[PDB]
Structure 1
Amino acid sequence: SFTVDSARGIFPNTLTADVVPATIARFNQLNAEDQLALIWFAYLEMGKTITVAALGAANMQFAEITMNQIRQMSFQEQTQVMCDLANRTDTPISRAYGSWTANIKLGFWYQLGEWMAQGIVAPIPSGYKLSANAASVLQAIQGLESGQQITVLRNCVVDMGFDTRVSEPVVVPRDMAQRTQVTIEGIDNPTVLNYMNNMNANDFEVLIELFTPDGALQPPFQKPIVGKDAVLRFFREECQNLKLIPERGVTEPADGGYTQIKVTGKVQTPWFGAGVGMNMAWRFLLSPENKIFFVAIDLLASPKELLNLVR
């Protein structure tokens, strides 16, 4: 009936925010110093604050030695290390950065940014002029949805340093008594509801059992992650402490007794809490036995896409 690759195209009227990869591609053309300065100004205009809970994350112990070495370097040495990271140059610090998780890399740059404000780490030079191309990229970022802006910033951060490792603890699932349950207008399918509720409870061991053995999950702007082993690994490293707020859905038959379901809603990341709500869609292809053969998670082009629930 279906393959993972043939499942990718379900609900093809779904308009995803491909301006996000487009803008990252433009950013990737800039030289190291331009990139660092662009992100500094983009972060400022973003006008959103990282939560205290994320700011004190215990995983930063893996980077403490590296940050404290940078803090002691001269401004000229600090600037060179930051360019090495942006250039993806092969240096020892860049290799250590490359072994870190995404959340550690983000906390690393958050700390360096705090230090630049406090006069401890070399700042963006007072008379830096963004290149013509960089200024245009900066403007484009200012015109994005807040959810789209933080996705551009995160993906730029994650891709610096050396190409691929630190292992982090996994959050403990929320107690059954403390759990909430989602309500999706138009959807009572238990597999989809269980997906949302177990995600919100960080109950990844129950979540993975919703999938077929050859099932796949496709994160935004990434290729499908195939098989329970790889999906469970992805859940444990990337999907911690999210808040999924699905609100609307539609279900319809597919070939071979399969069912395809599209859900739209908002998602909050623990980095920003309720400060940023990203507009998402989930596209499910469910087997006749009510298991997830494929789910794609998309960042939507604009809030009106929340209402786009035709077949």
Structure 2
Amino acid sequence: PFTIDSARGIFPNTLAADVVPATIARFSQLNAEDQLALIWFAYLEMGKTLTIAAPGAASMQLAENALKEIQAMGPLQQTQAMCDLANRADTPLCRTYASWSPNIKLGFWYRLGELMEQGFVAPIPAGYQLSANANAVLATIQGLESGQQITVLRNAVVDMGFTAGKDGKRIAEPVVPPQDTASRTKVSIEGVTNATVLNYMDNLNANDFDTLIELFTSDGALQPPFQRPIVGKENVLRFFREECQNLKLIPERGVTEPAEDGFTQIKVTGKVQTPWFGGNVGMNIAWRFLLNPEGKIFFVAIDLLASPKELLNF
């Protein structure tokens, strides 16, 4: 209850799926052309059983100029551009890409994937064989749960491009209006009646970010899977609006314990669906909340769990 960074240690029994950042770190080592081929291979294979939702209209408009620029290039330059992104080279295209929210980056690649499939953008060379390191990276990915697989792909997409500057322009999709109060569902969590936790889940499921942020302490933080804590209301609200639209949180069960100085720690496990996959992928998630004496959120971590055996009382 003293520092955000120390709160990261609550519920240390929770086995997170650290194969995901392990696998990203291996992937990130690879030659850029192998990075692109590996993801193309993983995307095609995944596409046999799992269809990516179409990118939204707003997102596509925001990426349109950059997409058109690539499509207008000669094939060799197309491949160079894609390699630039994967290598995190400093180019205008890479800087533009880095200004984008994850969803806009994902929609940019969705479009390129389609164009590569159709042959209008330079495809991976015919009969391309992955490097030794890359083949093993792909094998690891394909052995993971689908929730882990899609998190690897997202993290690979988000990592591309080049950031120059701390206060650079941030482009995101427009913010959706909150769900009308009448049509809102309420979660039920075995063992957990805590109104802060329940309001957290319900407000996020309604896209009600302005209500959600009011649950947090001024200095409070939210820690997304495999990322550092996002600290303070401005940054946490920004993150909700840019990256947390249209989720479906399906918490199942939890456990509630005292913490130092009148705090309460609560762990919840359940599933989450992203709008990119809907009900076809349920990620196994834990939430770990540290609530202050008045019930506001000082810290919440969201963990992708190593396996379903990590869900409480499987």
Q: Which runs of 5+ in 2 are unaligned?
A: none
Change (3 A) 1:56 1:258: closer
The gaps in structure 1 that reach 5 residues or longer are none
Instruction: Report the secondary structure of 1:195's partner residue.
Output: helix
Report the Cα offset of residue 182 of structure 1. Answer: 0.1
Q: Distance in 2 between matches of 1:207 and 1:127?
A: 50
Does residue 1:235 correspond to 2:240, yes or no?
yes
Q: What is the identity, as a one-letter code, of the residue corresponding to 1:19? A: V
Structure 1 residue identity aligned to 2:52: I
Letter in 1 for 2:241: R
Distance apart, 1:2 and its partner CA: 2.2
Tell me which residue corresponds to 1:85. 85
Aligned partners of 1:133, 1:227: CA distance in 2, in Å? Answer: 40
Query: When the two structures are superposed, what TM-score results if normalisation uses the length of structure 1?
Result: 0.96
Structure 1 residue 252, shift from structure 2 partner: 1.1
Separation (CA, whole Å) in 2 of partners of 1:170 and 1:15: 34
Which residue of 2 is the match for residue 220 of structure 1? 225
Distance 1:76 1:230 in 2: 40
Instruction: Name the SS for the 2:306 alignment partner.
Output: coil
Kept after mapping to 2: 8 A contact 1:4/1:215: yes
Superposition misfits of 4+ residues, deviation over 6 angstroms: none
Residues 14 and 308 in structure 1, CA contact (< 8 A), matched pair in contact too:
no
1:38 counterpart residue number: 38
* Structure 1 position 308, deviation (Å): 5.4
Deviation at 1:306, TM superposition (A): 0.8
Offset at 1:227? 1.0
Q: Which amino acid counterpart does residue 199 of structure 2 have in structure 1?
A: N
User: Which one of the candidate residues 272, 293, 305 is aligned to 1:300?
Assistant: 305
2: CA distance between counterparts of 1:23 and 1:211?
33
Identity fraction in percent: 77
TM value normalised by structure 2: 0.95
Mapped to 2, the partners of 1:169 and 1:134 lie a distance apart of: 37
RMSD: 1.2
| 1:234 aligned partner, one-letter code | F
The answer to whether the Cα contact below 8 Å between 2:104 and 2:172 also exists between their aligned partners in 1 is: no
Following superposition, the deviation at residue 127 of structure 1 comes to 2.1
Which amino acid is the alignment partner of residue 132 of structure 1?
A: A
- What SS does structure 1 have at the residue aligned with 2:154? helix
1:253 corresponding residue in structure 2: 258
Q: CA deviation at 1:45?
A: 2.1
**Cα distance change of structure 1 residues 255 and 178 upon mapping to structure 2, 3 Å threshold:** same
Aligned residues: 307
1: distance between equivalents of 2:225 and 2:42? 22
Q: Are the equivalent residues in 1 in contact too, given 2:221–2:236 (CA < 8 A)?
A: yes
Counterpart in the other structure of 1:193: 198
The answer for the alignment partner of 1:244 in structure 2 is 249
**In structure 2, what is the Cα distance between the partners aligned to 1:99 and 1:192?**
32
Provide the rounded CA distance (Å) in 2 between the counterparts of 1:57 and 1:241: 15
Distance apart, 1:63 and its partner CA: 1.3
Query: Which of 262, 265, 274 pairs up with 1:269?
Result: 274
Alignment of 1:49 with 2:51, yes or no, is yes
- Name the counterpart of 2:17: 17
Do 1:225 and 1:231's aligned partners in 2 also have CA atoms closer than 8 Å?
yes
Q: Distance in 2 between matches of 1:286 and 1:297?
A: 15
Question: Per-residue deviation at 1:167?
Answer: 4.4
Query: How far off its partner does 1:275 sit?
Result: 1.1
Contact 2:189 2:252 in 1 (8 A): yes
Does the Cα contact within 8 Å between 2:104 and 2:173 map onto a contact in 1?
Answer: no
Q: Does 1:113 align with 2:113?
A: yes
For 1:70, what is the secondary structure of its paired residue? helix
